[PDB]
Amino acid sequence: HVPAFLTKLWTLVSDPDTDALICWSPSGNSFHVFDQGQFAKEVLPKYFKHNNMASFVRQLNMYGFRKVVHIEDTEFQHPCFLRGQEQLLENIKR
Ligand code: NA
């Protein structure tokens, strides 16, 4: 059993029709969320049935996702959340 959240998240990231707001990084080892306000207003209701970024991020945290930042516009990642590898979602837990 792979949690519906992860399957939906993988499909959403991979969808080219949504890449303006959420997409894979070039290497496919992480994903980006652009325009958080628009993302929460437009994408989250359609795919996750709410409009709250904090709730979305809480789910990411629950599954052990990390945030990627520049060394001294949000990038999230999990070692088993990879482009073209939906079958690896089975290894994500929590
Ligand atoms: Na996408």
Amino acid at 68: V
Resolution, given in Å to one decimal, reads 1.7
State the residue range of the domain holding 94. 1-94
Exposed, middle or buried by CB within 10 Å (0-12, 13-18, 19+), for 24?
A: middle
Q: What is the number of structural domains in the chain? A: 1
Determine the distance separating the centroid of ligand 1 and the alpha carbon of 19, expressed in angstroms.
4
d(CA 65, CA 81): 9
Q: How far is CA 86 from CA 37, 68, 73, in A?
A: 27, 21, 24
The edge-to-edge listing of strands for the beta sheet with 74-77 is 22-24, 31-33, 74-77, 66-68
Q: For tokens 């709250």, what's the residue?
A: 52
Determine the distance separating the centroid of ligand 1 and the alpha carbon of 10, expressed in angstroms.
9
CATH number at residue 7: 1.10.10.10
Determine the distance separating the centroid of ligand 1 and the alpha carbon of 93, expressed in angstroms.
23
Phi, psi of 77 (to 5 degrees): -160, 155
